[PDB]
Amino acid sequence: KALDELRKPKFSSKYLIQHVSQKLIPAVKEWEKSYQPPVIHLGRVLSVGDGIARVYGLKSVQAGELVCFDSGVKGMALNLQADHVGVVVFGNDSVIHQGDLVYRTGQIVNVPIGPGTLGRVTDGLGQPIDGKGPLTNVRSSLVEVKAPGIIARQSVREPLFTGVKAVDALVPIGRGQRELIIGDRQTGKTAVAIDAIIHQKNCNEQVPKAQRVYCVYVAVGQKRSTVAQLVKLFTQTGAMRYTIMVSATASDAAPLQFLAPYSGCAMAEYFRDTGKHGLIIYDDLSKQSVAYRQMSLLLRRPPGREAFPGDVFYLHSRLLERAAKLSKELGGGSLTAFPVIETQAGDVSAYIATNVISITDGQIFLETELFYKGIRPALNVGLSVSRVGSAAQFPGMKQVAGTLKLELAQYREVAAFAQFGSDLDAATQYVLERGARLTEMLKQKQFAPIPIERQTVAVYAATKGFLDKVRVQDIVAAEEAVISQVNPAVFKILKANGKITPALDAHLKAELRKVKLPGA
Template identity: 40%
Template sequence: MFRSALRQSARVATVAAASSRISAARAVAPVANSFRGYADKASPTEVSSILEQRIRGVQEESGLAETGRVLSVGDGIARVHGMANVQAEELVEFASGVKGMCMNLEAGQVGVVLFGSDRLVKEGETVKRTGEIVDVPVGMELLGRVVDALGNPIDGKGPIKSSKRSRAQLKAPGILPRQSVSQPVQTGLKSVDAMVPIGRGQRELIIGDRQTGKTAVALDAMLNQKRWNNAAGADEAKKLYCVYVAVGQKRSTVAQLVQTLEENDAMKYSIIVAATASEAAPLQYLAPFAGTVGLLHDYTWQMLDVEAPGWYKNPLFGVIFHSRSAFDRVTRLAPLTLSPGLTCQLFALKPPGRSFFKNLLYPQGRFWAIYAHTMKKPGVKGYRVYFGSGTDTLDGVRSRTKMYKPFVTRGIPRMVRTAFRQGYRITHTGLLCWTPIPRPRDVPRVRALFLALEATLTCMFFVQTKHIEDMYWKHIFPWVREDVEYSPLCCRSALKETIRGYQDLSADQLEDIYTKRISHRRSLMRGYARTHKIRKLAKNAVAFRKKNAEHSLKHYNKDTVAGASKQRTRKAAIRSAARHPCGPCGRNFDSPSALKKHLGTDRHASKLALQAAGAAVAYRQMSLLLRRPPGREAYPGDVFYLHSRLLERSAKMNDKLGGGSLTALPIIETQGGDVSAYIPTNVISITDGQIFLEAELFYKGIRPAINVGLSVSRVGSAAQLKAMKQVAGSLKLFLAQYREVAAFAQFGSDLDAATKQTLSRGERLTELLKQKQYSPMAVNEMVPLIYAGINGHLDNVPVAKILQWESDFLNHLRTNEKTILDQIDKEGALSKELEAKLKDVIKSFTANFS
C-alpha cells in the first residue's frame, strides 16, 4: 500500500512539473518574439536555451566572472568553479589570503596551483580575480639578493626597492633584433675556455650524472666574472651579471652556494632565485631558508629546557616559558629576520671565520636585535668577539651599540672595557637577527625571548668564556670549542640576567606606561630646543635677529618667473644634448621614450645558470595533478615548449637595441650517463652546444670531468679570444685521439714511437687541464700553460709534477715576466715576437725545474 501511494505521489509531481513547464514556455514566447521582431518564429536552439533558463530559474549573478568557489583542494592544486573570464596564468586570491595561478582553463572550472599551503584553503571558499598576470620585480636593485620565484626577498635583507616589474612569461626576441655571437664569456676553467668556448648570448648545456661537478662549473664561471667586472670599472657594457636559478635543490645546497658567493665577494653582481626540493611543486616558490628561524628557536628552547641546578638561569624564565606552547606563542609575537650569513652558518659543520663577522649586516631602522662586535688590535694576530642584545623600547638596538666607545667606564661589559684598555678597537658591528620593536604590551615577554636568544647564540658560537655550566648545554650544538679561531669576550650567560620590565602588570597598564614615557620624552626635547634657541639669542641677539630677517627676505623676494624660465631652458638643453642617460650602461638618449624602449631590452650582458631538469620535473608533477594527459616518461606534451620558450630568450641583441646579451647555462642531470633520455635530447636540440661531464673521469680525479668527444660548442668559437684560438686550436682533437689510443693501448704491449709520444703528451695535457674548485684562472695565464703543453715543452716533466710545474711557472710569470701577461691581455693575440719570447721563457724555466 505504501508503494502504490509513493507511485501515485510521484505521478502527481510529474504532472505538476510538466504543467509548470508549459505555462513558463507560454510566458516566454511573447518575450522572445519581442526581441526577435524580424523573424516569424524562434529557432529550436533559442527556444531550448530560453526554456532551460526559465525552468531552472538560473539568473546570472553580478560579478560571477570575477569570483568563484573552491570545488576541491589537495596536493597544492585547487579546482575552482566560476571566474568565466579569467586569463591563463592570472593571479587569483583566496579568502584565506593564499594566492594562486590559473593553469587549466576548463569548461565550468579552473585549475589553480597554490603559492601557499593548501591546508589554509577550504572547499566552498570564495576566490576572486586580481586581473594581474604573474610578474616579478626587475632591475639592478636585485643584485646581491636571494629571492623566491615570485621575486620576494628571502635573505633577511629587507624589501627590494625596485620600481619596475615584468611578466614572468615574456616573448623571446625575434630574428631581426639579434646578431651573431661575438664576445666571449670567460669561465676561468682551462678545459672549457680552450676546448668548449662560450660566447655572450649562447645557450650551452651542462649535462652529466649527479655528483659530477655540474654546479661547480657554473659556480666557477660566476666567480670568474669578478675579475672582469672589476676591470670594467664604470663601463657597464663590459660587465657580466649572473643569475643562478636553483630548482629542486636541497636547502642546504643553496645555503652553501650563497655562502661561497659571499665569501668570494661575488654576490654584488649575482642574483639567486631559489625554489627548493623540500616542497611540492606548487610550493617550491617558498624560501629556501624558511626553516632556519625554526632551527634557531629549537636550539633556544633546548637551552631553556635543560636539566640544570637553579643557578643556571633566572627563575623568571621558567615562569614565562613554562612549556613549549608558551615559548611558541612568544616567538610569534616577534617574527625574526636572520642575517644571510647566519642563515648559511647554521648549516655549517664548524664555527665561522672572520669573514662571517665582517660581512654581518646592520640594517637601517629601529629594531630589537642580537649584535656582534669584532675587536682587533693593530699588530696583534687574532681577534675577539662579543655578542649582546639591544632591547630599548624607543631606539632599539642602536641605543645599545653606540655606547661601546674607548674610555667609557659605565654601561659596557667588564671584558670589553679591559679589551679597550689593552688597545683593542671595534672593527665591525653587525646584527645576527632582529625583529621590529614589539608592542608595549608584549615588551616584557619578548625581552625575555631575546635574552634567551642571546644566550643561545653566545653558547653556540662559543663567545662565552669556559664555565662549569658548559657541561649542561654543549651536547645541544654541532660545534666544539677547539675549532673556534677567535677569543670570547662574554663572561656569563644571558640566562642569569635580570629581565627588565613590569612582568606583573596587565597589557593595558603597560600601554599606559609607554604612552606616559613618550609624552615625557617629547616634553624634554621641546624644553631642550627652547633652551637652545634662548642660548643662541643671549650670546648675540643682534646677529641672531639679522640672520632670521635675511632668511625671510630671501624667501619673499624669490623670482618665480625667472626660475620657471631657467627650468625651461635647462630642459631644452637636456633634449638637445641627448641627456637621457641609462644608469646601468651609461648611454644617452634624446627622448624619454627612446630611453624607455632601451630599458625594455636585454641590454646588459647576463649569465643565467638554470636547473632545467628540476623545472621539468616540477612541471610534470603539476601537470599530472592538473590531470593533463601524460606523454613520454609521464611528461606533458608541451614540455619541449617549456624549455624552448625559456632558452630562446638567450640572445645577443643588435646595437640598435643596446648590444646586450643573455647567456644561458642550463643544467641537466642524467641517469647512468644516458644522454638519449627525453629531457636531455630535448634540451640538446635547443641549445648551441653541451658540456658533458662523465662520472668515470670524475672518479679518476680528472676534474672538471669533461668528456672531450661528446662536448661541443657550436657558436662559442667565433667569440673565442684569438690568442686562445691560436694555442688551443688542435687541443680538443689531440685529446680525443689520445683517449681513443689509450683505450686500445690497454690490449697491446708493442707500440710504435708515435703512439707512445701521443700517450705521453696526452697524459701531461690531461694533468695540466685539471683545476681545483673555486679557483678560476685569468685567460692571459691559461694561454702560456696550454701553449707549453700542446707544443711538447712538458714532455720531459714527470706527470706527477705537472701541477707543481704549473704553480711555479705561474708564480714565475707574475713576478719576473709580467710583461708577457700584460701583452697577452692587451693585444689578445700571440704575435711572432711574443710567441718566440714565451717559448724561450718556457724552455729556460722547464730546464731549471726540479
C-alpha cells in the first residue's frame, strides 16, 4: 500500500496554522481588500505566559532588539526562531494577550547615561523610581557595549581606597580592577561595599575634579525596603551626589534583574569613557544569574549544571571585563567593579562562584565563623587575594603591610595549637599575641570608613610594637587612643608626601609615645 507513506504527517513547524491562515482567508472572495495583518515590522502574540511572549511575524527584528507591545509594556526580542520570535517581557505579562500587536522599536536596549543620572534611583531599564521626575541631562547609550581591548587599556597603578582597614592593607584595590566580594549570607558583603561608596564622598571633597570617583550601586533581586534603606543612608551621609542607584528588586521581572547590571554598567561607563573614575558595585550577581536562568529555562534553552544555561560564564565575563583602566589616548578613565557573589555554607565550588572567582582579579572572602568571633569585617586573610596586589597600594601602607601580612601568616599556623595555654613556648606565644594585636587591629565598625593615612598609622602602631603593652581585649579602644591623641598634622603630611618619609617615621615614632594606651 502506497497510502501508508502519508500516514503520519511530518511537520517541519509548529505554527503551521498561522501560515495557512495567511493564504486561506484571502481566498474568501469578500476578503482581498487588505484584510491582512502585517508581518515585517509588526507582530502578533501567539503565546503569553511566565513573562515570555512568542510573537508571530516581526520579520525584520534584530537579535536583542527592544520591542513594544500595544499594551505599553516593552520587551526584548531574544530568540529569533525560524517561524516566531521569543520575546522576554520587561514587566508583567498579565496585560499581554494572544493576538496582541508587537511593535519593534528599531532599537537595541538603551539606558540614559550621563551626568543627569547622578543622585537618582532608577530601575533596571533607566526609568527613575525615586519620584523626582524624568532624567534631564542624559543621553541614551547602548547596554551591551564591547569591553575595551588590549590597546585601549593601561596598567592599574592608582589605588581606590575603600576605608576598610582589612582591605586597604591586606587586599589592596586599584582604580580599574575587579574585586569580588564573596561570602555567605549576612557576613558583611553589602557593608564592605557600602563603606567603599561612603568613603568616596569623604575623599571626593579633598581631591581635584579629575580624581573623583563616581559610584554606581546596582541592587539586583533585593527588596525595596533594603534599597530605600540604602538611599536613606546615602542621602544622610551625602554620598548621593556621586552615586547612581540602579534597582531591579525582587518584584521586578526576571529580564529586568538580568539587565540591571549591564544597564548599571553602561551608566558607570560614562564616567570611565570621559576621563573620570567610576566604581560599580553589582550587589548579588548571584541573583542576576538566577534571573538569567529563569529567563532561559522558559525560552527552552537546554539547562546545564544546576539548571543554569551554558552561557552563564559569558553572562558574567562580558559584564565584568567592562571594568577597565583606560589608556591615556582614551582619557585615562577607570571603572572599578565590585561584584558580590553569595555562597551557600561557604561552598565556593558552586557553579556561579567558580565562574566569577576566575573572572575577577581579586576576591574578598568573608566567613560566617570569623563574623561571630567578633572579627568584623569578616575577611578570611588566607583565601583573600588581590591580583593587582601591592602595585596599587598606598605607599606607607605598603611599608607596614609586609609586617602585617607576614605576622598574620604565622599567627594562622600557630593556631590549631592555641588551645593549650598551659603549653607556653614564648616563641609561638610571642606571635600568638602579636598576630592577635593585628587581628583586633583590623576590626572596624561599619558605616564609618577610615581615611587611609589614619589606617597606616594604626598598622604602624601595631607592627612596630607600640601596642604590645595593651591586652588583646582593648585594642579597638587603643586604636582610638592612637588616633585621638597624636598630633593631627602627622596625617596631613603623610597624605601629601604619600609615604612615611625618613623625616616622619622618627616624628611619629615619638608621637605614639606621648599617647596613653588603655593597657598597663
